[PDB]
Amino acid sequence: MKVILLEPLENLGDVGQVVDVKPGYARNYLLPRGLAVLATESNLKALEARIRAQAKRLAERKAEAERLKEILE
RNA sequence: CCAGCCUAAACCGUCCGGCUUGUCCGGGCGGGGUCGUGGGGCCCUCGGACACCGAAUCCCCAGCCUAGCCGAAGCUGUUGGGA
Ligand SMILES: [Mg+2]
Ligand SMILES: [Mg+2]
Ligand SMILES: [Mg+2]
Ligand SMILES: [Mg+2]
Ligand SMILES: [Mg+2]
Ligand SMILES: [Mg+2]
Ligand SMILES: [Mg+2]
Ligand SMILES: [Mg+2]
Ligand SMILES: [Mg+2]
Ligand SMILES: [Mg+2]
């Protein structure tokens, strides 16, 4: 099973990552310990918006301090 | 004997709660949609309301069921316990 994991995990990967486990690992450890969540299409999508909306949250807090470079220099 | 229909999904509005507040995610209601000459969603351009079609639902009636009622035309002998 593939999960997205909410915490950097040794052999696995870092947070936010989507990785393939053996279900046993997922259903009996990852999932239970809340260290990861099911790669549901219902959640790969809930990652589209976590992804884009902290990317444009700085794909604009840079487009903003760019004027402080237009006239404060 | 005769007859065909409703939906799920995209898509839109909504209300609720979950939260890492996100143009999201999930659940509920509504709309939308229902097909194989493929169909629907969405986006463009066009004539449709007064078009007509129409129930398997509902309303009234007829008819029927559960009691009934009307209904024609004969009398005398005669054997016989009795016609
Ligand atoms: Mg196995
Ligand atoms: Mg969705
Ligand atoms: Mg979506
Ligand atoms: Mg419906
Ligand atoms: Mg949807
Ligand atoms: Mg919606
Ligand atoms: Mg309102
Ligand atoms: Mg409908
Ligand atoms: Mg009108
Ligand atoms: Mg009719």
Curated annotation (Swiss-Prot):
Signal peptide extent: none
Highest taxon listed in the record's lineage: Bacteria
Family: Belongs to the bacterial ribosomal protein bL9 family.
Function: Binds to the 23S rRNA.
Protein name listed in UniProt: Large ribosomal subunit protein bL9
